[PDB]
Amino acid sequence: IDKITYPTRIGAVVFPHKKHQDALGECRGCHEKGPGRIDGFDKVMAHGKGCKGCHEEMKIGPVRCGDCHKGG
Ligand code: HEM
Ligand code: HEM
Ligand code: HEM
């Protein structure tokens, strides 16, 4: 499993998981409580430190709505 798709009303988001693990070369950063499900992962988390927040800080990755949400 390399890609994780999040089906959302506003347009589905595809998370290229392997790309991220290869790019960051670490697990604990995103998986604070050890690799596995991330408890409480939702819209607010994704728009925050869960997804968009990192892209803004690292200045790489999608930060604009449509660069994540695609498919109508
Ligand atoms: C080799 C290091 C990594 C390991 C072993 C790992 C492992 C996993 C596993 C086992 C899953 C599936 C969990 C499930 O089905 O509930 C997953 C999901 C996920 N991983 Fe990783 N991961 C790694 C690195 C990363 C990195 C670097 C990020 C952050 C850029 C990340 C973010 C996520 C997210 C957001 C999910 C979905 C969580 C959820 O749906 O609750 N992972 N990862
Ligand atoms: C201000 C611009 C954005 C808007 C207006 C927006 C809007 C939304 C909305 C309304 C939801 C809730 C689900 C739905 O109603 O369909 C959502 C979920 C989510 N958004 Fe965004 N989003 C934006 C930017 C982003 C960006 C840039 C990313 C990717 C880095 C992203 C990733 C996600 C993810 C992964 C979820 C699903 C979380 C879950 O499955 O619980 N969004 N977004
Ligand atoms: C589930 C939440 C996240 C979503 C939906 C997401 C989505 C994406 C997508 C679609 C790309 C662009 C891939 C491409 O170049 O085609 C990307 C790239 C990237 N993201 Fe995320 N991301 C998430 C979380 C994170 C987190 C938490 C970090 C930092 C702690 C991060 C760091 C990066 C970096 C470094 C890249 C460049 C990877 C590359 O192009 O090789 N992302 N992200």
Automatic annotation (TrEMBL):
Q: Does the keyword Phosphoprotein apply?
A: no
Cofactor binding description: Binds 4 heme c groups covalently per monomer.
Identify the residues that bind heme b 2. 17, 31, 38
Q: One GO MF term, please?
A: electron transfer activity
Q: Where does heme b 3 bind?
A: 19-20, 55
Q: Which domain of life is it from?
A: Bacteria
As cofactor, the record names: heme c
Which residues are involved in binding heme c 1?
51, 54-55, 68-69
Official protein name in the record = Cytochrome c
Species in which this protein is naturally found? Geobacter sulfurreducens (strain ATCC 51573 / DSM 12127 / PCA)
**Gene behind this protein:** ppcC
